[PDB]
């Protein structure tokens, strides 16, 4: 259906309309983590022929993840969170990262759609679609460790790029994705062009994710991994992440 805030937070189990404070950011952003999972499982299906993502009308993703219940992708989760940010008041700003891929490289520079909200005289990094481990609430734009459940963060700079960081309990830091600053935009995402299945969402205390038959958890930021043989249980682990929270 059309883009309806009230909607949007019943889905993500917010009461009201929360004033436009950090506060409320925070709690947004990780009702959304909890409770709209990341899915590409069909994100082809909703792939526009002419690949600029201004030709997928923004209805048709809200009506799949908000009124349908279903998870997506970032430029489909993150698109629809600047939309709200920005209905509630927010100085929201979209960017785009190269994201860290296991051999160490960065991949193509403007992969992973995400956003920056400024208020307050400060700079937030806001990011409700990430398959991967990441913070579950917004980073300040710092060098400056920043700790949240268990795990620390940091935003370093390096040859031009700001590099998001992260390390859990009993590991060392690694980066997430790079992004450049200055190339945020308020109507950055009108500017978008466009096999392993990922699914992740949030919980209370950290985060479950499932790439392919890997699953990863993370509470209080200690981190299990299993590699997953049963179906029974993959199915399990599927339901799980995919019902929210």
């Not at 920005?86 to 994201?99: K, S």
Request: with cysteine; charged share 25%.
């Amino acid at each position: 259906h059309m883009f309806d805030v009230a909607k949007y937070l019943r889905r993500i189990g917010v009461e009201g309309t929360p004033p436009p404070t950090l506060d409320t950011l925070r709690h947004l952003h990780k009702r959304h983590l909890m409770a709209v999972p990341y899915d590409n499982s069909t994100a082809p299906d909703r792939l526009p022929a002419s690949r600029h993502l201004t030709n997928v009308p923004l209805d048709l993703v809200f009506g799949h993840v908000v009124t349908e219940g279903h998870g997506g992708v970032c430029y489909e989760l993150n698109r629809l969170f600047h939309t709200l940010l920005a209905e509630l008041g927010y100085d929201v700003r979209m960017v785009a990262a190269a994201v860290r891929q296991a051999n160490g490289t960065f991949g193509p520079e403007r992969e992973h759609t995400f956003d920056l909200v400024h208020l307050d005289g400060r700079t937030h990094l806001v990011d409700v679609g990430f398959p991967g481990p990441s913070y579950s609430e917004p980073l300040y734009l710092s060098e400056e460790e920043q700790h949240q459940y268990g795990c620390s963060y940091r935003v370093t700079e390096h040859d031009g790029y700001r590099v998001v960081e992260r390390r859990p309990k009993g590991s060392d830091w690694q980066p997430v994705y790079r992004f450049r600053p200055e190339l945020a935009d308020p109507s950055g995402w009108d500017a978008v062009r466009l096999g392993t299945t990922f699914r992740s969402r949030a919980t209370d205390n950290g985060k479950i994710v499932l790439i392919g038959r890997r699953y990863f958890t993370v509470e209080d930021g200690v981190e299990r991994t299993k590699v997953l043989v049963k179906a029974d249980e993959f199915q399990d682990v599927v339901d799980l992440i995919l019902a929210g929270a």
